[PDB]
């Protein structure tokens, strides 16, 4: 790897600089380099890794959706034939997106997940696995689409099982996992009732535990609870 000659600490320092400069591709490359050193990640380092790739793939997803919409419009009745260019460019963006997802999944599989023994770390990594299979599923149209969807489901479910046993209902990682798995149900698995039920139960169980929290923890938990509420409002 091009980052093999750089110190782990320098890669982390530069990831933080890249974040400040909104250079998320660089941030992701630095964090990949840091993961490939082979040492486990701290909480802060997990956050850096996730922020970097979320921002890179988020931009790719937004671009893919623009192109896919243009392509769909081209295939309607009355639309003039404009040749293969829209499909080609949508495929180009799609292939790059898939590459990023495969890169993240590769880091998780070699070897972040297997070395993660604490509940927070294991849940966080399994959530990420679900997320990146979900992004693959968004663009899947072939023989493997069912298996990609099931890979996302399985990762989210394992994370959910750990989270419920090991973390309080207000824990931000538990909350974020539930938020994202609920979106998986609604958008990917064609299970809107499951999505709504999960968001509602997660919200309600968190509400009942807020009394245990400091002011700072309350702020963290309630921010994600509001995201659950926002989705419920969109869906009901």
């Amino acid at each position: 790897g091009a980052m093999g000659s750089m110190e782990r600490a320098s890669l982390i320092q530069k990831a933080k600089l890249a974040e400040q400069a909104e250079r998320y591709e660089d941030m992701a490359a630095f964090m990949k380099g840091a993961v490939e050193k082979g040492e486990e990640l701290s909480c802060e380092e997990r956050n850096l890794l996730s922020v970097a790739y979320k921002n890179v793939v988020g931009g790719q997803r937004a671009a893919w959706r623009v192109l896919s919409s243009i392509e769909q419009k081209s295939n309607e009745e009355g639309s003039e034939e404009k040749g293969p260019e829209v499909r080609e460019y949508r495929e180009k963006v799609e292939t790059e997106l898939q590459g990023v997802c495969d890169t993240v999944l590769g880091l998780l599989d070699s070897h972040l997940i297997k070395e993660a023994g604490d509940a927070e770390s294991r849940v966080f990594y399994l959530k990420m696995k679900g997320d990146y299979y979900r992004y693959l599923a968004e663009v899947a149209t072939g023989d493997d689409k069912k298996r990609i969807i099931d890979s996302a489901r399985s990762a989210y479910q394992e994370a959910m099982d750990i989270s419920k046993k090991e973390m309080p209902p207000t824990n931000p990682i538990r909350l974020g996992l539930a938020l994202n798995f609920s979106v998986f149900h609604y958008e990917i698995a064609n299970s809107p009732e499951e999505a709504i039920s999960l968001a509602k139960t997660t919200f309600d169980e968190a509400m009942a535990d807020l009394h245990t929290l400091s002011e700072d923890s309350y702020k963290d938990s309630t921010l994600i609870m509001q995201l659950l509420r926002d989705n419920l409002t969109l869906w009901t």
Binding site: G176, L179, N180, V183, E187, I224, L227, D230, L234
Partner: peptide, 5 residues
């Protein structure tokens, strides 16, 4: 799109 984190 719905919120994710």
């Amino acid at each position: 799109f719905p919120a994710t984190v």
